[PDB]
Amino acid sequence: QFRNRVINTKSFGGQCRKVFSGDGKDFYRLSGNVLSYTFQVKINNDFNYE
Amino acid sequence: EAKHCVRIETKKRVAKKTKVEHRCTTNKLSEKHEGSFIQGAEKSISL
């Protein structure tokens, strides 16, 4: 199970760290401290008939 | 189809006696069978 909030993910640190999500086609503000956050997609399909 | 059938006749005169008998039997068997089986599988994996 995922559990409760432990890290503050939205301390911007006085930075204006815009990222443009090419997926959502929108700008988001990253925190000042997160190392990376990126929006490239993978899709995996497994399909079985018996 | 199988049949076995016999007929017997006798007359004797000396007094007169006669006996005649006919016996017949038929046997038939038929059996019919049919069966069908089909199987199939698909796997599809896409990335």
UniProtKB/Swiss-Prot annotation, chain A:
It is found in: Secreted; Target cell membrane. C-, N- and O-glycosylated. O-glycosylated with core 1 or possibly core 8 glycans. Component of the membrane attack complex (MAC), a multiprotein complex activated by the complement cascade, which inserts into a target cell membrane and forms a pore, leading to target cell membrane rupture and cell lysis. The MAC is initiated by proteolytic cleavage of C5 into complement C5b in response to the classical, alternative, lectin and GZMK complement pathways. The complement pathways consist in a cascade of proteins that leads to phagocytosis and breakdown of pathogens and signaling that strengthens the adaptive immune system. C7 serves as a membrane anchor. It is linked to Complement component 7 deficiency: A rare defect of the complement classical pathway associated with susceptibility to severe recurrent infections, predominantly by Neisseria gonorrhoeae or Neisseria meningitidis. Belongs to the complement C6/C7/C8/C9 family. Monomer or dimer; as a C5b-7 complex it can also form multimeric rosettes. Component of the membrane attack complex (MAC), composed of complement C5b, C6, C7, C8A, C8B, C8G and multiple copies of the pore-forming subunit C9. This is Complement component C7. The chain holds residues 150 to 199 of 843 of the full protein.
Swiss-Prot record, chain B:
It is found in: Secreted; Target cell membrane. It comes from Homo sapiens (Human). Belongs to the complement C6/C7/C8/C9 family. All cysteine residues are assumed to be cross-linked to one another. Individual modules containing an even number of conserved cysteine residues are supposed to have disulfide linkages only within the same module. Disulfide bonds join 5-24. It is linked to Complement component 6 deficiency: A rare defect of the complement classical pathway associated with susceptibility to severe recurrent infections, predominantly by Neisseria gonorrhoeae or Neisseria meningitidis. The chain holds residues 395 to 443 of 934 of the full protein. Component of the membrane attack complex (MAC), a multiprotein complex activated by the complement cascade, which inserts into a target cell membrane and forms a pore, leading to target cell membrane rupture and cell lysis. The MAC is initiated by proteolytic cleavage of C5 into complement C5b in response to the classical, alternative, lectin and GZMK complement pathways. The complement pathways consist in a cascade of proteins that leads to phagocytosis and breakdown of pathogens and signaling that strengthens the adaptive immune system. This is Complement component C6. It comes from the Eukaryota. The chain crosses the membrane at residues 8-19. Component of the membrane attack complex (MAC), composed of complement C5b, C6, C7, C8A, C8B, C8G and multiple copies of the pore-forming subunit C9.
